[PDB]
Amino acid sequence: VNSFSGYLKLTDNVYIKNADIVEEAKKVKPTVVVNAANVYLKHGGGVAGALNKATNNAMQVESDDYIATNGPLKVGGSCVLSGHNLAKHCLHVVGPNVNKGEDIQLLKSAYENFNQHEVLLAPLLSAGIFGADPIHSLRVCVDTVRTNVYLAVFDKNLYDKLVSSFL
Numbered sequence: 001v002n003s004f005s006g007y008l009k010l011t012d013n014v015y016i017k018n019a020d021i022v023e024e025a026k027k028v029k030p031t032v033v034v035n036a037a038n039v040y041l042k043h044g045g046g047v048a049g050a051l052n053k054a055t056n057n058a059m060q061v062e063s064d065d066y067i068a069t070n071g072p073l074k075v076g077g078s079c080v081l082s083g084h085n086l087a088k089h090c091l092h093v094v095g096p097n098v099n100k101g102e103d104i105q106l107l108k109s110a111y112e113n114f115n116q117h118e119v120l121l122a123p124l125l126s127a128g129i130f131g132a133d134p135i136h137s138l139r140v141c142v143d144t145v146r147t148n149v150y151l152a153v154f155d156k157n158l159y160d161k162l163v164s165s166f167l
């Protein structure tokens with residue numbers, strides 16, 4: 001039993017809710033919140049911009065030190081950093097950004113990072129401003145993640161469409 005509330009159950013391990021991931025994180029304080037990161041951990045817009053703003057830019061400061069030490073992530077890769085005031089940990093995961101021409105096949109590799117954590121709050125990778133089909137992203141999530149994932153879907157029209165079209 002965990003403290004996630006109001007989610008629709010999609011499968012054995014995947015749950016979905018129309019919710020602002022920032023407001024969700026601030027309520028649940030999950031062990032892991034997933035950020036829709038880029039390889040540079042530049043948290044400028046989309047989910048990443050929102051999560052960083054909620055940390056008063058502490059996420060960005062920590063991220064810049066991470067990059068200065070380690071260099072960029074790989075597309076499809078991840079790193080674990082602090083969750084600041086939102087969660088214990090933030091798993092920064094890089095899905096391919098279609099608006100940069102990156103290979104959508106790397107979306108499965110990106111979701112594989114979730115399997116290293118027993119429970120997560122997460123967005124649909126590569127959705128929104130990353131330019132991928134959110135229905136496809138949800139499918140890859142369901143077919144790749146085996147741990148317990150709670151998906152926060154910001155856009156109401158998409159949440160209802162995601163539910164109504166789910167197979």
Ligand SMILES: O[C@H]1CCCN(c2ncnc3[nH]ccc23)C1
Binds near residue numbers: 129
């Ligand atoms: O355009 C959308 C694409 C998918 C990721 N995304 C989000 N998902 C959940 N909660 C959120 N809060 C602020 C942004 C956001 C933005």
